[PDB]
Design a protein around this ligand. Structure first.
Ligand SMILES: *CCC(=O)N1CCC[C@@H](n2nc(I)c3c(N)ncnc32)C1
Length: 276
């Protein structure tokens, strides 16, 4: 299905029906434009895959789109609104999110509150569990840059270009043969403290050295972090991949079950951080 913008209202449109409002971010999977649908006025994100582009980058863009299209019923994965195939380019209409957790960390200039990380943990775990269960997909790259938030308070994963069936969030069993949840724990410690636990390393291999040699970077106990938060991170940061719990066990954690029911005002916190 190409030439349709299903933003529950499907519009038979082309690429010329979108106004280019500038590029968002840089690099990563592909060139993402901020575009406005001239027919309705809605603003969406548009990935552009050039037919003449890098064959390795285009291979990841097509793999990401394959996962995104398969996940049209996962609330914690960015939805595709349609595609436009021309003789020169492929335009992938994605829903517009605010920013990634990495940029939230830089604009916050400090720790992100636990109540925000709780709603984020529930979203990312269910996203990874959805990719494993309904599709057999392993993310293989969970990082704050892959955790998007929006003005309404939604939290979703975005980049599946290297998934299958960066090195600083890599699990111990990936370096030396549930690896996606070690990356989630490293991301949680980073966002909960504002400091990356391996910022002292100067090379990629030195991070791999610290991951295997040093003890897991646990949460500090003097920042008011609840016991459920510290327990969930410790379970994620289990070095032996056999002792590390599966997704059906992590989804039953008290830290997960608490923020499934709790009402956290992520939307208001998001706009106040964006205004800083
Ligand atoms: C931290 C996020 C980031 O820098 N980045 C790279 C540039 C594109 C950006 N992004 N990718 C997608 I797919 C987006 C959607 N759907 N909305 C907003 N921004 C998006 C991710």
């Amino acid at each position: 299905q190409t030439g349709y913008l299903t933003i529950g209202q499907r519009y038979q449109a082309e690429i010329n029906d979108l106004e280019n409002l500038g590029e968002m971010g840089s690099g990563t999977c592909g060139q993402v434009w901020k575009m406005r649908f001239r027919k309705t006025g809605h603003v969406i994100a548009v990935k552009q895959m050039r037919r003449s582009g890098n064959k390795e980058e285009n291979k990841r863009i097509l793999m990401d789109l394959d996962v995104v299209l398969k996940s049209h019923d996962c609330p914690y994965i960015v939805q595709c609104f349609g595609t436009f195939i021309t003789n020169t380019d492929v335009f992938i209409a994605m829903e517009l999110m605010g920013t990634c957790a990495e940029k939230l960390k830089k604009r916050m200039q400090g720790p992100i509150p636990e109540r925000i990380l709780g709603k984020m943990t529930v979203a990312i775990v269910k996203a990874l569990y959805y990719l494993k269960e309904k599709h057999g997909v392993i993310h293989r790259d969970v990082k704050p840059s892959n955790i998007l938030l929006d003005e309404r308070g939604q939290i979703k994963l975005c980049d599946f270009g290297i998934s299958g069936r960066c090195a600083a969030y890599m699990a111990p069993e990936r370096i030396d043969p549930r690896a996606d949840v070690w990356s989630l724990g490293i991301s949680l410690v980073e966002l909960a403290t504002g400091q990356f636990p391996y910022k002292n390393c100067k090379t990629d291999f030195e991070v791999l050295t610290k991951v295997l040699q040093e003890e897991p970077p646990l949460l500090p106990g003097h920042m008011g972090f609840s016991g459920d938060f510290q327990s969930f991170v410790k379970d994620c940061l289990t070095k032996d991949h056999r002792k590390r719990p599966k997704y059906n066990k992590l989804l039953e954690h008290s830290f997960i079950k608490r923020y499934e029911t709790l009402e956290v005002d992520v939307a208001s916190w998001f706009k106040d951080v964006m205004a800083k």
